[PDB]
Amino acid sequence: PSYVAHLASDFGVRVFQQVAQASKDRNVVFSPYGVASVLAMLQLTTGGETQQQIQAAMGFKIDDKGMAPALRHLYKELMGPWNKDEISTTDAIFVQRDLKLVQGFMPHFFRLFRSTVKQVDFSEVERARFIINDWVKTHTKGMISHLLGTGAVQQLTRLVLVNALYFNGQWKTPFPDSSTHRRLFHKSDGSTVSVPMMAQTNKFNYTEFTTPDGHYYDILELPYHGDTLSMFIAAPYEKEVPLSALTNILSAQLISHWKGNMTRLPRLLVLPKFSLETEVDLRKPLENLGMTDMFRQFQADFTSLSDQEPLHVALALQKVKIEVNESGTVASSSTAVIVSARMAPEEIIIDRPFLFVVRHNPTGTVLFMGQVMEP
Amino acid sequence: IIGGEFTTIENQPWFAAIYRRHRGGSVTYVCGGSLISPCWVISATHCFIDYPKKEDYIVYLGRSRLNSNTQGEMKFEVENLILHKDYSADTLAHHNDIALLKIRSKEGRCAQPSRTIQTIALPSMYNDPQFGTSCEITGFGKEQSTDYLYPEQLKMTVVKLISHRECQQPHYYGSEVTTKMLCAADPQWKTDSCQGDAGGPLVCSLQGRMTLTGIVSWGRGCALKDKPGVYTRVSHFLPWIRSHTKE
Q1: Structural domains of chain B, count
Q2: Which of B141, B148, B218 lies closest to A341 in CB terms?
Q3: Same domain? B133 vs B216
Q4: Is residue B141 within 8 angstroms of chain A, CB to CB?
Q5: Distance between CA B204 and CA B238 in Å, rounded?
Q6: B-chain residues within 8 Å CB-CB of A179?
Q7: How distant, in Å, are the alpha carbons of A42, A289, A311, A362 from that of A46?
Q8: Burial of residue A59 (number of CB atoms within 10 Å: 0-12, 13-18, 19+)
Q9: Where are glycans found on this sequence (chain A)?
Q10: Residues with Cβ within 8 Å of residue B150, at least 6 apart in sequence
Q11: Is B30 in Cβ contact with A343 (below 8 Å)?
Q12: CATH number, domain A29-166+277-321+332-342
């Protein structure tokens, strides 16, 4: 339960740093949970060395006893009633309608996952793009209308996977609108840009850690309503240290080490508003983690899905959109903690590239992470 | 300070401006204070509790502006930083929120009197003005609780003393305010101290003397309906002050 959440998060964070490292100075949002989720589904379609590589890299086998039920329980907990139209997630695997499927695959897939692999005719290229994107649109309730990468879809395409997520959370304690002011943000190249930054004074879970190379960095926790989710902000103390110092040492276990070390402290926080949207071609990041066969036309083994085949993944995409602003309409019942103290509060100013992590606190699931290089 | 007016240090010549130097050498303003004797500034414990090391602080007397010099001002190191051992914080209240700072210049001297550097008097034990009395508060605190900036110039405003029965009402603060604290507010809630104002003085006329009646401590929001400013009641702390000013 917490277990498959640890394993999914560990795996998904590993994929994130492959994407973060391949775009050093670009904004990135990504879902570690989402990528784990779709690849757990894909496991069932694979055989031989292809299956082996996915299992080895992910750290678990979907057919292992208790695993599929555990992932099912995880899903219900994440998409529970706490969600005030804040989060949407969708997984989908599209296979050529024409292909003869192994007997008992679809019922087995439905049993373990309570959804179906979608059968689409790729020889109607324009219609295939429409279908795939329409799936993304309805299951993100319109927040994500389209993918760019579906342009690679082809009459000879046989297998596609997609994952899309939207998040706009309601803070336990809103940032007051009056406090939102324009402020200088220091980009990694040394240039500055004027950018709207929210401000709020209250009691935040906070901790300071050290890199292996000796460098200090802040971690703050901003809880969403009812404390079901939190956002973590992490950034080096000194302007000269690049954000890469942090992302190079990122792991799921480090995130929870940060959380376990936190103490609630009165602070004034200045944080940029941001809206990021990233479409990630999953091929390279997954290849770097050892999953090379699944993308190779003749080497790929999807014989658990269909056996008369050359069959491989032509396209694997994730698309994520996140909004961070002041708002907080609270499904939170514990009145409110405030800073009553009238000293000038100690300030934490986030005015240089920072990373963020959105987590589900009861399970420890890393739902989202990213780097904001420029708000 | 919410509301009120810009003032000068000559109008508040006991006012002390207290700053902390961070790691890496930057210097920020933390709290107000009040000069009670040549070598002693009185303030609030919560200002210093998280950084209790005397070497981190700078105290100014005769300072009229936040980030520039005033002619006649004196700069001081803290030779001794005394916090109250019974200080604690509940959900809201700060208890025994009172501190003492012993000051020393680089040339090794205490405060030297002038037009802009004066001591304020202490009340006598348990001696307070009646509820309803108009008193004055001063500081470099925020003009609005949602502001990021602090005013460059010192501010002052008038507030009225409010009884413990009225302050201890459930829609006010309940049992969060003790008899060791004092509440003051505007009748129309247009005027109050705020963040950056802690440690500073609540000044009342008492038996023909300009008297340190309270020390800015805490409140819920600044200038909020049924949420008065809350002040350390100085007249309940004289044995503490007197014993600790010996050293």
Answers
A1: 2
A2: B218
A3: yes
A4: yes
A5: 17
A6: 146-148
A7: 7, 17, 10, 32
A8: middle
A9: 205, 261, 325
A10: A344, B29, B66, B140, B141, B142, B196
A11: yes
A12: 3.30.497.10
One-letter amino acid at B119 equals T
Cβ <8 Å between B146 and A176: yes
For CA atoms B205, B207, B210, B216, give the dihedral sign: negative
Contact B199, B121 (CB under 8 A): no
Name chain B contacts of A337, Cβ cutoff 8 Å.
91
Domain that holds residue B158: 1-12+120-235
CATH at residue B17: 2.40.10.10
Q: Where are the domains of chain A?
A: 29-166+277-321+332-342, 167-276+322-331
Distance CA A347, CA B30 (A): 11
Six token digits for residue A311: 């069959």
Looking at 3.30.720.210, 2.60.120.10, 2.30.39.10, 2.60.40.10, the CATH number of the domain A167-276+322-331 comes to: 2.30.39.10
Is A306 within 8 Å of A102 (Cβ atoms)? yes
User: Both B93 and B130 in a single domain?
Assistant: no
From chain B, the residues in CB contact with A346 under 8 A are 50
Please tell me the distance from the alpha carbon of residue B109 to that of residue B124, in angstroms, as a whole number.
28
Residue type, B94: H
| Domain identity same for B168 and B231 | yes
**Is the Cβ pair B28, A344 closer than 8 Å?**
yes
Final resolution, Å = 2.3
Among chain B residues, the shortest Cα distance to A237 is held by: B24
